[PDB]
From Swiss-Prot, chain D:
Compartment annotation: Nucleus; Nucleus, Nucleoplasm
Record's function text: Probable ubiquitin-protein ligase which is mainly involved pre-mRNA splicing and DNA repair. Core component of the NTC/Nineteen complex which is part of the spliceosome and participates in its assembly, its remodeling and is required for its activity. Together with emb-4, necessary for interaction of rnp-4, a probable exon junction complex component, with mRNAs and spliceosomal snRNAs. Plays a role in nuclear retention of unspliced mRNAs.
Keyword list, A-Z: Developmental protein, Differentiation, DNA damage, DNA repair, mRNA processing, mRNA splicing, Nucleus, Repeat, Spliceosome, Transferase, Ubl conjugation pathway, WD repeat
Protein family per UniProt: Belongs to the WD repeat PRP19 family.
Quaternary structure (record): Homotetramer. Component of the NTC complex (or PRP19-associated complex) which is associated with the spliceosome.
Interval of the full protein contained in this chain: 1 to 131 of 492
Protein name: Pre-mRNA-processing factor 19
UniProt source species: Caenorhabditis elegans
Length: 41, 100, 131, 121
């Protein structure tokens, strides 16, 4: 099953970014701007 | 000389950087010393060793003792994707297990 | 009167609507416009004296104008505008997640790259000794 | 009949289909999509507000309906947050995968050069 390979890949990626885990998930600049542009319209 | 000759060297040097830098993908704020540990006994371990040098180059600006050209790395990358097969397609089953 | 004429840009005292119109006209404007033009100032439909109807206010039962700014319609409206924004935001997030998730699934060479390294190093370990 | 909008994934009171893709949308969302992006949201072809074709078509208690709005709004925002969280995880997994690939290219480059030494010993 794919779950094992997914688990190992996700776990290593999380571990490499371990110092970033305390940071909130970002809002992309494209997404932030398209909210603002719709609000301005 | 100041413009397009440097601009070629700017993009040429940028083509030597890791694809994380070229795509501006996320890179860690610090190279985690816990993740980099390896048994030094398998092919995965020596790839992880060189991966630590790439992370230092991108995070710490601590470049490696040698950097290979894009042509060498592309020729190496070709040797990977000619070998690899049966790579998983994205499907609802994958969506289920990634959510888990 | 608080209606402003769409043609002259000044406030009415004789507002008039017709079935082919949409912007407001003055009676004392449209009748001379019919005489010279015969033509709707905005839609260019044909104008005739039976089309014009004149607006009035202050009749019995007419509700008092809500001036407080808040209202149920306007709150439901802006809540709807929030929902439209959040779904279009979520759609572009979902699109980006699908693209990123797709290519990383295709990029799962790690196990097959490792076998190539094993194959390469085991060749090297013989090539290092046949010399 | 129930019609589901391809942008929201929810029922619509005003279903509309786009000739550039054949997918069904809420009129209000797709007009706002056109008015911002100018494209079909699914096929990415050029799309405009004149190209939409219209499809054919009790209450409970006001505090109850307001509590449905509260619980439903928290669900929509939970979806929006988890998408941002999952998107960054996808970007972190991707950058790791590219790092594994580029490090593997360095190894394969390194080993393939060292394998030339056996021909000149």
């Amino acid at each position: 099953a794919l779950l094992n390979q997914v688990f190992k890949s996700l776990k290593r990626a999380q571990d490499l970014f371990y110092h970033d885990y305390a940071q909130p998930p970002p809002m992309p600049e494209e997404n932030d701007s398209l909210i603002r542009s719709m609000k301005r319209k | 000389n100041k413009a397009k000759r440097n601009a070629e060297n700017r993009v040429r040097n940028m083509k030597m950087r890791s694809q994380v830098i070229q795509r501006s993908l996320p890179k860690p704020t610090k190279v985690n010393e816990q993740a980099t540990r390896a048994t030094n006994s398998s092919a995965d371990d020596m790839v992880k060793a060189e991966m630590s040098k790439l992370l230092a180059w991108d995070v710490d600006n601590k470049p490696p003792s040698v950097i290979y050209s894009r042509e060498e790395l592309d020729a190496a990358a070709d040797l990977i994707k000619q070998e690899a097969e049966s790579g998983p397609e994205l499907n609802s089953l994958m969506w289920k297990v990634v959510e888990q | 009167m608080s209606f402003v004429c769409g043609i002259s840009g000044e406030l009415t005292e004789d507002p008039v609507v017709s079935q082919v119109s949409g912007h407001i006209f003055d009676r004392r404007l449209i009748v001379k416009f019919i005489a010279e033009n015969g033509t709707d100032p905005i839609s260019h439909g044909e104008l005739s004296e039976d089309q014009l109807v004149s607006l009035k206010s202050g009749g019995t039962g007419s509700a008092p104008r809500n001036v407080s700014g808040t209202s149920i319609p306007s709150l439901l409206k802006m809540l709807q505008d929030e929902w439209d924004t959040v779904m279009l935001n979520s759609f572009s997030l979902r699109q980006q997640l699908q693209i990123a998730r797709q290519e990383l699934s295709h990029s799962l060479y790690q196990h097959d790259a490792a076998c190539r390294v094993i194959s390469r190093l085991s060749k090297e370990l013989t090539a290092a000794r046949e010399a």
